[PDB]
Amino acid sequence: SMSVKKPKRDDSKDLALCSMILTEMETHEDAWPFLLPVNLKLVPGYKKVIKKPMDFSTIREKLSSGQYPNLETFALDVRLVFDNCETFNEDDSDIGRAGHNMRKYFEKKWTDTFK
């Protein structure tokens, strides 16, 4: 509360570390569905159904341009990629499986880096 602060968690490496995590996700073999925005002209249903589209290139641009106020808003966008994927794709599709694999991969790196 006013003039009463919890001790300062060192966040000075957060930007670099999120950037490293994102690099790892970008270079994963199962990242291919997620590297660019889903083409809304060519994928019927996507525009209407997925209210907040997100992809790795869009996270990378946001990260490089100071549009994440903190490491939690970065994690929210990464999870949004996977949440969108599950909303739109059957679990037993290549894309559906890729999205589960990538979410697992991400969450481990997130835990090991920050928890």
PDB file of C-alpha atoms in Angstrom:
ATOM      1  CA  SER A   1       0.000   0.000   0.000  1.00  0.00           C
ATOM      2  CA  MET A   2       1.057   3.634   0.203  1.00  0.00           C
ATOM      3  CA  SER A   3       4.770   3.865   1.173  1.00  0.00           C
ATOM      4  CA  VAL A   4       4.740   0.025   1.941  1.00  0.00           C
ATOM      5  CA  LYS A   5       6.479  -2.049  -0.758  1.00  0.00           C
ATOM      6  CA  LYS A   6       7.253  -5.771  -1.228  1.00  0.00           C
ATOM      7  CA  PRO A   7      10.942  -6.305  -1.967  1.00  0.00           C
ATOM      8  CA  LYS A   8      12.056  -5.438  -5.623  1.00  0.00           C
ATOM      9  CA  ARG A   9      12.123  -8.588  -7.926  1.00  0.00           C
ATOM     10  CA  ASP A  10      14.935  -7.917 -10.463  1.00  0.00           C
ATOM     11  CA  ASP A  11      13.205  -7.544 -13.833  1.00  0.00           C
ATOM     12  CA  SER A  12      16.127  -5.980 -15.716  1.00  0.00           C
ATOM     13  CA  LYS A  13      16.873  -9.125 -17.767  1.00  0.00           C
ATOM     14  CA  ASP A  14      13.220  -9.870 -18.593  1.00  0.00           C
ATOM     15  CA  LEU A  15      13.343  -8.321 -22.137  1.00  0.00           C
ATOM     16  CA  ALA A  16      16.405 -10.334 -23.144  1.00  0.00           C
ATOM     17  CA  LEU A  17      15.136 -13.499 -21.655  1.00  0.00           C
ATOM     18  CA  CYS A  18      11.659 -13.242 -23.314  1.00  0.00           C
ATOM     19  CA  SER A  19      13.566 -12.545 -26.602  1.00  0.00           C
ATOM     20  CA  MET A  20      15.599 -15.791 -26.116  1.00  0.00           C
ATOM     21  CA  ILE A  21      12.475 -17.813 -25.346  1.00  0.00           C
ATOM     22  CA  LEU A  22      10.771 -16.370 -28.486  1.00  0.00           C
ATOM     23  CA  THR A  23      13.867 -17.276 -30.586  1.00  0.00           C
ATOM     24  CA  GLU A  24      13.636 -20.808 -29.350  1.00  0.00           C
ATOM     25  CA  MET A  25       9.918 -20.961 -30.247  1.00  0.00           C
ATOM     26  CA  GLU A  26      10.624 -19.410 -33.709  1.00  0.00           C
ATOM     27  CA  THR A  27      13.235 -22.119 -34.479  1.00  0.00           C
ATOM     28  CA  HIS A  28      11.189 -25.135 -33.269  1.00  0.00           C
ATOM     29  CA  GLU A  29      10.274 -27.451 -36.141  1.00  0.00           C
ATOM     30  CA  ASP A  30       6.593 -27.404 -35.175  1.00  0.00           C
ATOM     31  CA  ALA A  31       6.465 -23.520 -35.206  1.00  0.00           C
ATOM     32  CA  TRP A  32       5.385 -23.385 -38.882  1.00  0.00           C
ATOM     33  CA  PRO A  33       1.637 -22.801 -38.249  1.00  0.00           C
ATOM     34  CA  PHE A  34       2.516 -19.856 -35.936  1.00  0.00           C
ATOM     35  CA  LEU A  35       5.266 -17.913 -37.658  1.00  0.00           C
ATOM     36  CA  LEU A  36       2.964 -15.486 -39.458  1.00  0.00           C
ATOM     37  CA  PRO A  37      -0.559 -14.196 -39.070  1.00  0.00           C
ATOM     38  CA  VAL A  38      -3.228 -16.559 -40.346  1.00  0.00           C
ATOM     39  CA  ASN A  39      -4.314 -15.267 -43.737  1.00  0.00           C
ATOM     40  CA  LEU A  40      -7.851 -13.945 -43.039  1.00  0.00           C
ATOM     41  CA  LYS A  41      -8.732 -13.767 -46.769  1.00  0.00           C
ATOM     42  CA  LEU A  42      -7.817 -17.389 -47.359  1.00  0.00           C
ATOM     43  CA  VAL A  43      -8.927 -19.240 -44.204  1.00  0.00           C
ATOM     44  CA  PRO A  44     -12.703 -19.327 -43.985  1.00  0.00           C
ATOM     45  CA  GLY A  45     -14.123 -18.932 -40.522  1.00  0.00           C
ATOM     46  CA  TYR A  46     -10.972 -17.491 -38.956  1.00  0.00           C
ATOM     47  CA  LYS A  47     -11.854 -13.841 -38.975  1.00  0.00           C
ATOM     48  CA  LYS A  48     -15.233 -14.317 -37.328  1.00  0.00           C
ATOM     49  CA  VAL A  49     -14.387 -17.037 -34.899  1.00  0.00           C
ATOM     50  CA  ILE A  50     -10.955 -15.866 -33.525  1.00  0.00           C
ATOM     51  CA  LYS A  51     -11.537 -12.532 -31.955  1.00  0.00           C
ATOM     52  CA  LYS A  52      -7.881 -11.769 -31.129  1.00  0.00           C
ATOM     53  CA  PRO A  53      -5.438 -13.337 -33.672  1.00  0.00           C
ATOM     54  CA  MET A  54      -1.840 -13.633 -32.551  1.00  0.00           C
ATOM     55  CA  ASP A  55       1.340 -15.156 -34.035  1.00  0.00           C
ATOM     56  CA  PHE A  56       5.078 -15.195 -33.361  1.00  0.00           C
ATOM     57  CA  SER A  57       5.973 -12.441 -35.861  1.00  0.00           C
ATOM     58  CA  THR A  58       3.437 -10.128 -34.230  1.00  0.00           C
ATOM     59  CA  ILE A  59       4.811 -10.961 -30.731  1.00  0.00           C
ATOM     60  CA  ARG A  60       8.372 -10.360 -32.059  1.00  0.00           C
ATOM     61  CA  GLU A  61       7.409  -6.915 -33.447  1.00  0.00           C
ATOM     62  CA  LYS A  62       5.594  -5.987 -30.196  1.00  0.00           C
ATOM     63  CA  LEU A  63       8.646  -7.148 -28.160  1.00  0.00           C
ATOM     64  CA  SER A  64      11.131  -5.208 -30.322  1.00  0.00           C
ATOM     65  CA  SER A  65       9.020  -1.982 -30.059  1.00  0.00           C
ATOM     66  CA  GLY A  66       8.256  -1.716 -26.299  1.00  0.00           C
ATOM     67  CA  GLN A  67       4.677  -2.836 -26.529  1.00  0.00           C
ATOM     68  CA  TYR A  68       4.886  -5.355 -23.585  1.00  0.00           C
ATOM     69  CA  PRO A  69       4.748  -3.493 -20.276  1.00  0.00           C
ATOM     70  CA  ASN A  70       5.954  -6.559 -18.416  1.00  0.00           C
ATOM     71  CA  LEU A  71       6.834 -10.263 -18.838  1.00  0.00           C
ATOM     72  CA  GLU A  72       3.199 -11.349 -18.004  1.00  0.00           C
ATOM     73  CA  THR A  73       1.667  -9.466 -20.898  1.00  0.00           C
ATOM     74  CA  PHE A  74       4.268 -11.292 -23.161  1.00  0.00           C
ATOM     75  CA  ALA A  75       3.196 -14.686 -21.752  1.00  0.00           C
ATOM     76  CA  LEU A  76      -0.478 -13.797 -22.298  1.00  0.00           C
ATOM     77  CA  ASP A  77       0.194 -13.236 -26.076  1.00  0.00           C
ATOM     78  CA  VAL A  78       2.206 -16.455 -26.424  1.00  0.00           C
ATOM     79  CA  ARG A  79      -0.643 -18.445 -24.719  1.00  0.00           C
ATOM     80  CA  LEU A  80      -3.173 -16.640 -26.976  1.00  0.00           C
ATOM     81  CA  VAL A  81      -1.403 -18.221 -30.017  1.00  0.00           C
ATOM     82  CA  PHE A  82      -2.064 -21.684 -28.544  1.00  0.00           C
ATOM     83  CA  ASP A  83      -5.519 -20.944 -27.292  1.00  0.00           C
ATOM     84  CA  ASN A  84      -6.530 -19.704 -30.736  1.00  0.00           C
ATOM     85  CA  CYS A  85      -5.008 -22.812 -32.298  1.00  0.00           C
ATOM     86  CA  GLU A  86      -7.066 -25.110 -30.025  1.00  0.00           C
ATOM     87  CA  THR A  87     -10.290 -23.158 -30.680  1.00  0.00           C
ATOM     88  CA  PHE A  88      -9.898 -23.577 -34.446  1.00  0.00           C
ATOM     89  CA  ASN A  89      -8.120 -26.914 -35.003  1.00  0.00           C
ATOM     90  CA  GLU A  90      -8.907 -30.499 -34.061  1.00  0.00           C
ATOM     91  CA  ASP A  91      -6.426 -32.021 -31.519  1.00  0.00           C
ATOM     92  CA  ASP A  92      -5.730 -34.841 -34.080  1.00  0.00           C
ATOM     93  CA  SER A  93      -4.640 -32.523 -36.940  1.00  0.00           C
ATOM     94  CA  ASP A  94      -1.103 -31.646 -37.702  1.00  0.00           C
ATOM     95  CA  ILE A  95      -1.722 -28.029 -36.724  1.00  0.00           C
ATOM     96  CA  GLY A  96      -3.642 -29.066 -33.519  1.00  0.00           C
ATOM     97  CA  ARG A  97      -0.729 -31.338 -32.472  1.00  0.00           C
ATOM     98  CA  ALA A  98       1.836 -28.647 -33.277  1.00  0.00           C
ATOM     99  CA  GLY A  99      -0.025 -26.223 -31.001  1.00  0.00           C
ATOM    100  CA  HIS A 100      -0.060 -28.661 -28.080  1.00  0.00           C
ATOM    101  CA  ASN A 101       3.624 -29.419 -28.555  1.00  0.00           C
ATOM    102  CA  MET A 102       4.542 -25.716 -28.713  1.00  0.00           C
ATOM    103  CA  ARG A 103       2.531 -24.856 -25.628  1.00  0.00           C
ATOM    104  CA  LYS A 104       4.326 -27.609 -23.709  1.00  0.00           C
ATOM    105  CA  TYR A 105       7.665 -26.406 -24.967  1.00  0.00           C
ATOM    106  CA  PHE A 106       6.877 -22.798 -24.022  1.00  0.00           C
ATOM    107  CA  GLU A 107       5.604 -23.505 -20.545  1.00  0.00           C
ATOM    108  CA  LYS A 108       8.728 -25.474 -19.591  1.00  0.00           C
ATOM    109  CA  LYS A 109      11.046 -22.689 -20.763  1.00  0.00           C
ATOM    110  CA  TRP A 110       8.841 -20.165 -18.892  1.00  0.00           C
ATOM    111  CA  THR A 111       9.053 -22.127 -15.629  1.00  0.00           C
ATOM    112  CA  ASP A 112      12.732 -22.813 -15.911  1.00  0.00           C
ATOM    113  CA  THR A 113      13.626 -19.251 -16.811  1.00  0.00           C
ATOM    114  CA  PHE A 114      11.369 -17.333 -14.375  1.00  0.00           C
ATOM    115  CA  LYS A 115      10.005 -19.699 -11.569  1.00  0.00           C
TER     116      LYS A 115
END
